């Protein structure tokens, strides 16, 4: 999930935007 | 600013800035 992708590893814009409505 | 480790309030702040008027969902357990 987002924690694994952005907190425990380096985040990206591509992955943040997947969580926008 | 997004290309770093972002945890807790830092991650929610990034979501807020990136997603703008769309809003977002923050689901740390899923």
Curated annotation (Swiss-Prot), chain A:
Transmembrane segments: none annotated. Coiled coil: none annotated. Disulfide bonds join 6-11. This is Insulin A chain. It comes from Homo sapiens (Human). The chain holds residues 90 to 110 of 110 of the full protein.
From Swiss-Prot, chain B:
Transmembrane segments: none annotated. This is Insulin B chain. It comes from Homo sapiens. The chain holds residues 25 to 54 of 110 of the full protein.
């Amino acid at each position: 999930g987002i924690v694994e992708q952005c907190c425990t590893s380096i985040c990206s814009l591509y992955q943040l935007e997947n969580y926008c409505n | 600013f997004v290309n770093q480790h972002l945890c807790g309030s830092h991650l929610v702040e990034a979501l807020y800035l990136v997603c703008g008027e769309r809003g977002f969902f923050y689901t740390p357990k899923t």
